[PDB]
Paper text:
To investigate the binding mode of antibody CB017.5 with the central conserved region of G, we determined the crystal structure of Fab CB017.5 in complex with the G peptide to 2.0 Å resolution. The complex crystallized in space group C2221 and contained one complex in the asymmetric unit. Ordered electron density was observed for 35 of the 45 G peptide residues (Asp162–Lys196), including seven C-terminal residues not observed in the Fab CB002.5 complex structure. However, the tip of the cystine noose in this structure showed weak electron density for residues Asn178, Asn179, and Pro180, indicating that it is structurally flexible in this complex. Fab CB017.5 buries a total surface area of 1,081 Å2 on the G peptide, primarily mediated through the heavy chain, which buries 720 Å2 (67%). Interestingly, Fab CB017.5 has little interaction with the cystine noose itself, but rather establishes the vast majority of contacts with conserved residues N- or C-terminal to the cystine noose, in agreement with peptide binding studies. The strictly conserved residues of RSV G from His164–Cys176 account for 443 Å2 of the buried surface area and make six hydrogen bonds with the heavy chain of Fab CB017.5: three with the side chain of Glu166 and three with the main-chain carbonyl group of Val167 of the G peptide. Additionally, Fab CB017.5 has a substantial interface with the residues C-terminal to the cystine noose, burying 638 Å2 of surface area extending from Arg188 to Lys196 and forming hydrogen bonds with Pro190, Asn191, Lys192, Lys193, and Lys196 of the G peptide. This indicates that the cystine noose contributes to the proper conformation of the epitope by bringing the conserved N- and C-terminal flanking residues into close proximity.
Author numbering:
A (entry chain L): 1 to 9, 11 to 95, 95A, 95B, 96 to 210
B (entry chain H): 1 to 52, 52A, 53 to 82, 82A, 82B, 82C, 83 to 100, 100A, ...
C (entry chain G): 162 to 196
Write the structure that this text describes.
Amino acid sequence: SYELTQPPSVSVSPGQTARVTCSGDAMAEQYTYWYQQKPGQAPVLIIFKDTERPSGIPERFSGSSSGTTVTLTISGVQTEDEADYYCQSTDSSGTSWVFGGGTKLTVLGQPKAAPSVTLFPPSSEELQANKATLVCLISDFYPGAVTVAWKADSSPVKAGVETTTPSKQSNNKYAASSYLSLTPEQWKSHKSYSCQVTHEGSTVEKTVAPT
Amino acid sequence: QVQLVESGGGVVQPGRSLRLSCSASGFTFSVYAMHWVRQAPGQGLEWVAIIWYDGSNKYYADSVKGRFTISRDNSKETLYLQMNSLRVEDTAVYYCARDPIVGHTRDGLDVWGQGTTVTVSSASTKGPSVFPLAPSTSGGTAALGCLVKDYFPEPVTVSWNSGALTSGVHTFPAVLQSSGLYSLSSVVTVPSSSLGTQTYICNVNHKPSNTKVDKKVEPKS
Amino acid sequence: DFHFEVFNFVPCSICSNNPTCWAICKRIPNKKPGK
């Protein structure tokens, strides 16, 4: 029932000031807390009781409150500050704990890079197994956010699509994968299939045909 | 050092039960409240339950009320979560965290463990099928890989040429399909002039099913 | 003002049988205090 409202994403450049707000109907009577979580790691306490910063947390992190809205402020953001930030509080009765939806803070710490796309048709071995999977591999892009669109011939297709969230490569650039599941007859009937990747207002498209 | 270690996670079928443990060390466990907090893959943190320092007050999220039971053993400095009537949507990493309730220099969930993984699914243990991603000019590069399809449960590890090939290797995270089975791909970028001489073999290892697959990836035709 | 770990007080639940501890200790409340 009781929910905290937190923006899903905030983007910032190094040296700028990042702000993450979080609101809740009972925040004027209940303390709020802020946690930082990096990919693959446990959350870490950043701000407690609205405004207090524990010893060992850098001074650039601070918190303030205006009543039913609290704000996490990071002055002079560093690349190491890129993480998911969660607000947390309690309901009006003080017997139920609630987390906000989380804010992904993106720190633009390297120049923008356009993605490279490689589209694999279904292998003959999988087709012999009465299955068909088109594999669209996206690589070497930054920031780590893409949208993938599949097309049968010229019309969009959304059924049977599975796309992974971008993860960092070894060269600190991002990669992602998208799958289009089909039947063998679906793969042989259409003239072509295409994987369309959109990244930073630019579009990269590859096409394969069963001939 | 102040430390929290979760254990007891595993793979179970819906309706079954599972008991998690969280062993503390490095601090006076008996004066802190203890939380359970879970996180589904790719999702946010969700509070599960809390127990008072003396084991009296116990509060639960509505999503687990009547099914999960929290308890603690201060003599062993251990926190427990009894999970009954498990559901698919209970699949998450489960953290424990201490909470002083009235802390001064620190407050809230100020110390977290690393978590333990719980997977609730009606699927059974199954090894994967490995299909090649065959490569298709002027000193360029070409991408080739392996499609590790329809395995359960996680994880699966992929290497290339028994670990000798690491440059340009990227193993993607898994995808949970509607069938309840996982699939991922591992790709490596190599010079296009080596596709006729160099041999490329992906080494797939699925420990939960005790399945190992070596698959050679060749250009088509 | 005795401090114990993250607390600015000594919890009475760890005093055992020390009389001087019970004269300065404070009890952890049954409810999380509000603002």
